[PDB]
């Protein structure tokens, strides 16, 4: 799906930093039991966050703060888990009289 | 995978309607515990159907009737769930003497 | 993901044969509870192998021997299962001061 | 039309084999008196099967088993006969108030 | 062949409507025993019309009225049947002295 | 299918002329009850010829003489009729052990 | 507009010949006072024919016979005159509730 | 020429509606005796409006209200008639000392 | 049609100037009642000239002198009016024996 | 240069025929001593015609009648001779204050 | 030239097999002394066949049976020899009055 | 090789006609025993002409007259035979000190 | 050939002006009897200048002054006449030992 | 026009050498008073040769021997002069009945 | 076919030189009676060499020494003659069981 | 060949770091005496590692830890040495009966 | 370099087979100590052959027979080893006076 | 690698000449035991030169004089040998904190 | 800038030769203190020539003779020096009232 | 470099006018001794202006007023002179730890 | 010209570093009075180095060490000054006999 991450400030060892996650539900159905995770070497001990069911076609944002511990090019990895994302889907528009 | 849906009649509020689902197993292995679901706003309370294991390379069809309840452009969403669809696969043709 | 298979010898009914599986972890995070499976008609009763967690960005190889039982064009199918492969991921490089 | 054939197992002289035929009615009208035939050198004495009228836009599948008699590259030919397939058709979508 | 259909008015449930069919004989030979059919869900009980042999290269038009019975996106299907349309043809221009 | 016609001499009013028809069976199955017809304005009163069943993949040739009756650019039309040409076919190569 | 002409036989000095004119009204409005003309050197003294108003989107055909008087490459010119063809038009589809 | 139409509100049976016509004189000369017409099935009994001569290169706008009478996809057709539009023109820029 | 204009000298306020008009009849029929007009701001009070019927495929030239009255970039507009230019035409080459 | 020829009627052995020659002076200078020639096998004994000096940028037309003497595909060749056509020219626009 | 070969059955060691050769004379002249040869390793001891002169533009077919002696991918080579095939040719269409 | 033919006059039944053959030796070696042949239906009984050895890179021309006997589109075929044209050649430029 | 003209100052009515002509002999042979001419409306009464034979591959320049007499966009035309420019040439590089 | 030159031997100082000139008349008319010239530095004092009128569409060849006098890359220039080559031509195919 | 030549040393008048010829049999059949020839102006009096039959698909090499006699750009021409090279061939891969 | 390197952690002066090397044998033959080397400025004193013969088509991985000594953009260079990598190879698939 | 392999017969278990190796020295220098090797699974125990120094630009061929031992798709690998193939080369053509 | 050669003067038999060799080390590692060789027919008896280890990324130049002995197009070949050039390398940029 | 050089004769050791230099001032300003130099190995001891200031947009030619002293491919280098050529320029056309 | 000029008002003879010059230093080094010049025919007697050293990457603007003296299309030329603009430069980004 | 710079080690504040400059003379003439300069912010106080005249076509290398004083992305700029680089050049290859 289309998950994006943006830093909302500079990243400096010690200084607090903030990232925003933006996810748009690609499906016209509700995504249930949505768990977001965030990790990265020298950045953030694995964080896990509960997200409210995401209605079909809906975008959600979340903000997460972290304090970098080690300097240099480092990765921040966000993930999203829900049962509806392991299913194969098919969609048809029905134009009802 | 390649799941398709086709209406087998007109969609009118009240009048019964019928959709056919066609799924071709992309894998040369059996898909087990196959559950099909069907939903859509103003169309069909979430329907869930058991499907027999789908042998490798095999296509299955199913027909499902519904009565539209609310008019206008509406979505019908079919889904397919099986453990084998969350696995990463690799295939090589072996030409045996 | 990028899973590949290579035969390390000729395939003849009776004669033992060997295939190598090479998988590169696409994610910068650890893949846990990794199970590899191997099957194919006339080739190999379903084999299941435990793999050690795969660190982020890491490649693993495995060798598996089998004795073809039936001749002709036949498929060997390798699969890989891990919870981290059913999650949607997003990655940003953070350049830390 | 779009008729497809898939083998549902290996082809070996003697051993039984199975093919699946998948046909999607291209027309929004019913195909009547549908006869399917199957043949091939060294494969299958000409088999002829009755198929139920195929409603407009509908897909049908059929499974047919055969025992190869002679080895090597061989053809399996499926055919479909119905009066509606020798007619020239024209279709317009009418959007009715 | 090139069969076309055009509505000669608006389509409203109840109100009479009219469609014109235009067919150009692609062959330089006469099409005999030409039967035109017209159908569509919620539009027109299957209508069947006799057409006079169509000389080579000749276009014919026909007008057919119908009363839509059910609203929404609906199909009107015209067909044309003649023995000469199931034959394979080859044409050469001979420049005679 | 691929039917071709070639003149085997000049076309002059009065003078006898000869055309050759070459047809290659596109299907790997036998074409039965094959009737060839030949016509053209100012060229040849409708000629009809019986052809022997055409085995799969087989080419046949036939020669037909005519005496042009009227000068100018004129058409010669050859046709081929057989029940197997109104059927929809599907072919798969089976590689048998 | 799209006016077409087709010969419905060979053209020989003396022998009668026939041409068909096919015109499709490009406008969704009625073409009134429609006059068709036909001429050509060595073919047809200027012929003028009255045509019934052509409803919007409607195709009309007409057949006209002539006797060529002089041989060689010659032109047949058909024309169509109506006041509505000298007007500049603009069309918008209005989708009415 | 470039005539355009725009709806200045929604189209509902009964409710009044308004369309604007915009025409830009393509010619550097005056268009005289300019008559605009407006029609459409289920929309507007043929309306005819006098327009003041349109100076060369000049754009004019006009607003026309109508009450849709019948629902569904319907056409509104605007036309423009003037003697200068049936003439063939040629333009050269002369750069005068 | 293809009307062209060329200046046959320099354009200076006061000094006489000359333009040539070249028109090639696109139609294989005669253009009757041909009126040519010439105008332009600061160039030429509207001039109107009678032209002899233009036979099919024929080119005509005319020369017209004018005295520019006002300086700067100015337009000269030539027009051509004939009833045959408001008709829709169709042409077929007939090759007569 | 751009010399063109058009037949102003049909070409028949015996019958008189007419061709028009159209030449546009490509040079902004006068072409002097202009001789036009016309010839063709079975068409026209070499005809030679004097043409008046052709002012710069000027088009001239001429009509020439001939009686074909021998039938079939034949060439008509027009030529134009003037001293100014064997000179190499260069042109620059000077924009004078 | 365009020589083609087609198998008219399966190729099995021992079992008889049949190939058809189709050759279309590219030249509008007669090919004389035409010898066809057929060979292939493990297929057919060199066979040589006399063919009747091939008139210009004419296609000939021939059928030749062989019994494969040795298995595997094998070549069948057909050749055609005639003096007219070692000559360099040039062709012009002459349109005779 | 590059053999060309040109008619040096019109082709009329009875009237004498003339064709020129132009052949450029593609090889830097001498072509010996060069025989030219000319034929065509309704044109020229097979003519055979001796040509002098053609030095490497050399062009030769020949003129041949014939009297067409039968009218219409007809072929003239020129051929060239020499032993050096059935050989496979290879050329390298050697730059000698 | 490649003749160019350049103004070596501004062009103002009255004020003297200067143009340079540059011509490069395209031929490897001498151009004899070379006459250059210069003209233009409102610029320069026809000037004629003798030029010395131009050796093969040689460029010559000439300067010519004129006084514009009339303002506005005006043409200056340079020409070059020599017998060698009306000849058709062919050039081959010979590499001599 | 298309004039070509070919050396018919090696070029060595002292040794005699031979060049062939091939010219194809591009015009369907006769080229009269045809003079060919040949020159080149260190190759051939200007040679001038009379050629017989070249009928329309006709190719001529000529052979000319020379003795190179000075070594190195040198040019041989052939030219062709005739009055018909300084004329502007136009050609139309007339298809005569 | 693909014949190549390579010099195996420098080419100097007097000094011996060596060329290698490499030919790959394009046909899967044997080339018999293979004669190779070598010639070139100022290089090698015509040399003729017998070559052993060339089995199908086989490459042969040959070395030939010569003493250049005359300096400058010179050609060496190798040729290959065999009856099998004047035959037209057709090849099909037969996959034998 | 295709050698790749991946860091399995962040690179910080002092902190230990780990790189993985992945090499796929491109050859279907065994690579013997395989030595891997690793170096880089400010990264790793030249490390040399013995690798077991690499069977044909086989991939090997190795992990190597290092402690960066100096900061900034730095190179890590892996190399692979074996005698089989300095040989030129050619491979053909033989399909054996 | 460009090493090629060709089978000179069919490959059958037991039956002797023959392959030809063709190598063209890409370098203008001599390749010394040239060793060719041949191997393949189920085909040929590693064969090693001495080759004579290969002069610059020279092609060599070698024939090697083997008896396949095991059936199916199998590889034959040829290699070539020489010190000059591990060197980096640069070549410039010097044109010496 | 990128080795280049440039002549630093003209090449004449007898006269001394000079070439410069420029080699840029493609690797970020040191090339050891670097031997440069120079040869060419008629140019330079094989010269061999010791070069100092080439640090990573470093370019070296060398000048070598020779006296051409034999005239004509001749090759100068430079080579470079070092153990590091027969190794397969992989490079990753590590950005160290 | 655009400086060109052309030889005005053959280059032979001893024999005098002549080159022409053509330079077009790219700038609309005067180039002052213009020095031209000419040199080349075995051609011309460095020659230096004074050139008169080159007005804006002006082309100059110069002829320089030299006697080649040494044979073979040799360079002639012309240069041009002026202070205005080391300046960076910008040009705008101002259209003044 | 990138020097631009813009008029900051209309250009009229007599009326004062103003141009702005904008130059961006392309080099990361200081441009010293920078002299700007401005000239144009009928515009501005050569103006010369001192500019302060231009630091690396820096843009400077200057405004210069002039009074056009003569009308028509005229050039304004700005130039820039500095020693650093006649030097050849090379730039590498060094990323320093 | 083509000047390049390469670092021959890592860049760290304090630590010594080394850059190599490589310049290839683009001109076939000698570059005299060649001065190289090197500078960069936080890298190297302006260094100036004398270089020996660079013969035509010759490459020179130079090594220069510096100690970075300030960290971060910084520029090193090399320049080259010589009078011959401000001259406009033209080169022609003369092939001398």
Domains of chain O: 1-97 (2.60.40.10)
Chain centroid to CA Q48: 11
DSSP 8-state assignment for residue R34? E
d(CA N36, CA F81): 66
Rounded to a whole number of angstroms, the CA Rg of chain G reads 17
Is J96–T71 a contact, with Cβ atoms under 8 angstroms apart?
no
Distance set, CA P67 to CA I16, P14, P41 (Å): 94, 6, 12
3-state SS, one letter per residue, for M30-95:
CECCEEEEEEECCCEEEEEEEECCECCCCEEEEEEEECCCCCEEEEEEEEEECHHHHCEEEEEEEE
C-beta atoms of O96 and D70 within 8 A = no
Q: Tell me, in Å, the resolution of the deposited structure.
A: 2.3
CA–CA min distance C63, chain D (Å)? 25
CA atoms within 13 A on the CB side of P12: 14
Answer for the pair G27, G84: CB distance below 8 angstroms, yes or no: yes
- Whether the CB-CB separation of Q38 and Q46 falls below 8 Å is answered with yes
**Bridge partners (DSSP) listed for residue N37:** N48, N79
Q: Render R30-68 in DSSP notation, one character per residue.
A: PBPSEEEEEEETTTEEEEEEEE--B-TT-EEEEEEEE--
* Residues shown for chain S: 97
How many angstroms separate the first and last alpha carbons of chain O? Answer: 33
* CB count in 10 Å sphere of residue U83: 12
Yes or no, beta carbons of A70 and P9 under 8 Å apart? no
Tell me the nearest-neighbour CA distance from D77 into chain K, angstroms: 14
Chain A partners within 8 Å of R96 (Cβ): 72
DSSP SS3 for O25: coil
Residue with tokens 């027309």: D27
Residues G13-50: b if buried by 16+ CB within 10 A, e if exposed = beeebebbbbbbbebbbebeebebbbbbbbbbeeeeee
Q: How many CA atoms lie within 13 A of O15 on its CB side?
A: 15
Q: Measure the CA–CA gap between O48 and O51, rounded to whole angstroms.
A: 10
**Alpha-carbon distance T95 to U12, whole Å?**
9
Residues of E in contact with D93 (CB under 8 A): 73-75
Q: What is the DSSP string of S18-69?
A: EEEEEEE--SSSPBPSEEEEEEETTTEEEEEEEE--B-TT-EEEEEEEE---
Q: How many CB pairs under 8 A join H and I?
A: 82
Q: Give the span between the Cα atoms of G68 and I94, in whole angstroms.
A: 10
O-R contacts (CB, under 8 Å): 12
Contact O29, O84 (CB under 8 A): yes
Q: Which residues contact U1 (CB under 8 A, 6 or more apart)?
A: T88, U23, U24, U25, U26, U80, U85
d(CA U55, CA R20): 11
Q: Which chain I residues contact residue F72 at CB under 8 A?
A: 95-97
Alpha-carbon distance of Q68 to Q13, in angstroms, equals 5
Residue of R nearest to A73 (CA): R95
Reading the block at residue E68, the tokens are 């839509």
Give which of E73, E74, E75 to mutate to test A binding, by max A Cβ within 10 Å: E73
Residues J48 and N87: their CA atoms lie apart, in Å, by: 13
Neighbours of chain R (3+ CB pairs under 8 A): A, L, O, P, Q, S, U
- Across the interface, of P13, P43, P75, the residue whose CB is closest to R97 is P13
Question: Cβ(I30)–Cβ(I56) under 8 Å?
Answer: yes
Please state the separation of Cα A44 from the chain's center in Å: 15
Buried b (16+ CB within 10 A) or exposed e, H12-38: eeeeebebebebebebbbebeebebbb
User: Dihedral angle at the C-alpha atoms of A24, A27, A29, A30, nearest 10 degrees?
Assistant: -30
Chain C residue with CA closest to A5: the answer is C92
Experimental method: X-ray
Nearest residue on chain L to F72, alpha-carbon basis: L72
Count of Cβ atoms closer than 10 Å to residue A71 Cβ: 19
Set of chain M residues whose Cβ sits within 8 Å of the Cβ of T74 = 10
CA M70 to chain H, closest CA, distance in angstroms equals 9
Shortest Cα–Cα distance, R57 to chain U (Å): 7
Extract the runs of DSSP E, i.e. beta strands, from chain N: 2-7, 17-24, 34-40, 44-51, 59-66, 72-81, 88-96
Residue K87 to residue L78: CA distance in whole angstroms = 10
CA distance K97 to chain Q (A): 59
Rounded Cα distance, F20 and F76, in Å: 11
Candidate from U6, U7, U61 with C-beta closest to R61:
U61
Q: Pick left, alpha or beta for residue B85 (phi over 0 → left; psi -120 to 50 → alpha; otherwise beta).
A: alpha
Residue R62 near residue R21, CB atoms below 8 Å: yes
Length of chain H counted residue by residue: 97
CB contact under 8 A, N88 and J80: yes
- In angstroms, rounded to a whole number, what is the distance separating the alpha carbons of residues J74 and L7? 12
Closest approach of T19 to chain U, Cα-based (Å): 29
Say if T and P touch: at least 3 Cβ pairs within 8 Å. Answer: yes
CA separation for the pair B66, I7 (Å, rounded): 77
Q: Do P70 and U12 touch (CB under 8 A)?
A: yes
**Contact exists between S and C (3 or more beta carbon pairs < 8 Å):** no
Q: Are strands F34-40 and F72-81 parallel, antiparallel or unpaired?
A: antiparallel
For the CA atoms of U21, U24, U30, U31, the dihedral, rounded to the nearest 10 degrees, stands at: -40
Question: Could you tell me if H39 and H77 are in contact, meaning their C-beta atoms sit under 8 angstroms apart?
Answer: yes
Q: Six-digit token pair at B29?
A: 């292995």
Beta pairing partners, N34? N51
With beta carbons less than 8 A apart as the criterion, state whether G23 and G35 touch.
no
> Mapping DSSP to helix (H, G, I), strand (E, B) and coil, where does residue T85 land?
helix
- CB pair distance less than 8 Å for P91 and Q76: yes
Name which of O52, O61, O97 to mutate to probe chain Q: the one with the most chain Q Cβ atoms within 10 A of its Cβ: O61
Cβ pairs bridging C and D (under 8 Å): 12
Residue corresponding to tokens 């408001």? I86
Q: Residue K17 forms beta bridges with which residues?
A: K66
Give the residue on K whose Cα is nearest the Cα of D43: K10
3+ Cβ–Cβ pairs closer than 8 Å linking D and Q: no
Mutate to test the interface with S, among N72, N73, N74, N76 (most CBs of S within 10 A): N72
Q: Are Q50 and Q76 in contact (CB under 8 A)?
A: no
Closest CA to U6 of R56, R2, P72: R56
Residue O95, number of CB atoms within 10 A of its CB: 15
Which of F12, F71, F73, F75 has the most I C-beta neighbours within 10 Å, making it the best mutation to test the interface with I?
Answer: F73
The rounded distance, in Å, linking the Cα atoms of O46 and H38 is 91
What are the start-end ranges of the E strands in J1-41?
2-7, 17-24, 34-40
Counted across chains C and Q, CB pairs separated by less than 8 A come out at: 12
Minimal C-alpha gap between N29 and chain J (Å): 8
Selected residue of E7, E9, E10, E74 to mutate for chain H interface (largest H Cβ count, 10 A): E10
CA distance Q16 to Q39: 15
In the sheet with P17-24, reading across from the earlier edge strand, the strands are P2-7, P17-24, P59-66
Query: Tell me, what DSSP letter sits at residue A41?
Result: T
Burial class (CB in 10 A: 0-12, 13-18, 19+), C2: exposed
Sequence-separated (6 or more) residues with CB below 8 Å from residue R11: Q94, Q95, Q96, Q97, R17, R68, R74, S72
Name the minimum distance, in Å, from the CA of Q58 to any CA of chain S. 29
Grouping H, G, I as helix, E, B as strand and the rest as coil, residue A39 is strand
The H or E element spanning position G95 is strand G88-96
Q: If contacts are CB pairs under 8 Å, which of residues 2-61 in chain Q contact chain P?
A: 3-7, 10-13, 17, 19, 21, 23, 37, 39-43
* Greatest extent of chain C over all pairs of C-alpha atoms, in Å: 62
Full strand arrangement of the beta sheet holding S17-24 = S2-7, S17-24, S59-66
For residue P71, the chain T residues in CB contact (below 8 A) are 97
Check D73 against O96: CB less than 8 A apart. Answer: no
Cβ–Cβ under 8 Å, residues Q10 and Q87: no
Going N52 to N54 to N58 to N61, the CA torsion angle's sign is: positive
Closest residue in N to J74 (Cα) is: N94
Per the CB < 8 Å rule, is T92 touching U43? no
**Lateral strand order in the sheet of E59-66:** E2-7, E17-24, E59-66
Chains that touch N (3 or more CB pairs under 8 A): G, J, L, M, O, S, U
Q: What is the distance between the alpha carbons of residues M17 and M7, in angstroms, rounded to a whole number?
A: 8
Cβ contact A–S (≥3 pairs, < 8 Å): no
Question: Do you know the residue count of chain R?
Answer: 97
User: DSSP string of S71-87?
Assistant: -EEEEEEEEEE-GGGGS
CA nearest A73 in P: which residue? P10
Distance from CA of E45 to the nearest CA of G (A): 24
CA angle B34, B39, B40 (to 5 degrees): 155
The region, left, alpha or beta by phi > 0 then psi within -120 to 50, assigned to residue N41 is beta
Contact C27, C2 (CB under 8 A): no
Pairing verdict, β S88-96 and D59-66: unpaired
Under DSSP, the state recorded for A30 is P
The alpha-carbon gap from S72 to the nearest alpha carbon of chain N, in Å, equals 10
Spatial neighbors of I36 by CB under 8 A, at least 6 apart, are I21, I48, I49, I51, I62, I78, I79, I80, I81
Side-chain-side CA neighbours of residue K15 (13 Å): 15
CB spacing of K80 vs O87 below 8 angstroms: yes
- Shortest alpha-carbon distance between residue U83 and chain T (Å): 9
Contact I11 H96 (CB under 8 A): yes
Strands annotated E in J34-71? 34-40, 44-51, 59-66
Write phi, then psi, for G54 (nearest 5 degrees): -110, 110
Q: Which residue has the tokens 């001569």?
A: H53
Contact O94 K86 (CB under 8 A): no
Question: If you ran DSSP here, which 8-state letter would residue D74 be given?
Answer: E
Question: What is the length of chain F?
Answer: 97
C63 touches C19 (CB < 8 A) = yes
Mapped onto helix, strand or coil, the DSSP state of residue F37 is: strand
Q: Checking phi first, is residue I33 left (phi over 0); if not, alpha (psi -120 to 50) or beta?
A: left
Task: Give the up-direction half-sphere exposure of residue S87: CA atoms within 13 A in the CB hemisphere.
Answer: 23
* G30 and G48 Cβ atoms separated by less than 8 Å: no
* Contact state of O5 with L91 under an 8 Å Cβ cutoff: yes
């Amino acid at each position: 799906s289309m998950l994006s991450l943006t830093l909302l400030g500079a990243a400096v060892v010690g200084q607090e930093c903030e990232v925003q996650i933006v996810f748009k539900n690609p499906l016209p159905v509700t995504l249930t039991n949505v768990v977001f995770r965030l990790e990265g070497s020298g950045l953030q001990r694995p964080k896990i966050l509960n997200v409210g069911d995401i209605g079909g076609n809906e975008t959600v944002t979340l903000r997460q703060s972290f304090v970098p511990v080690r300097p240099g090019p480092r990765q921040l990895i966000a993930s999203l888990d829900s049962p509806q994302l392991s299913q194969v889907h098919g969609v048809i528009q029905v134009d009802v009289a």
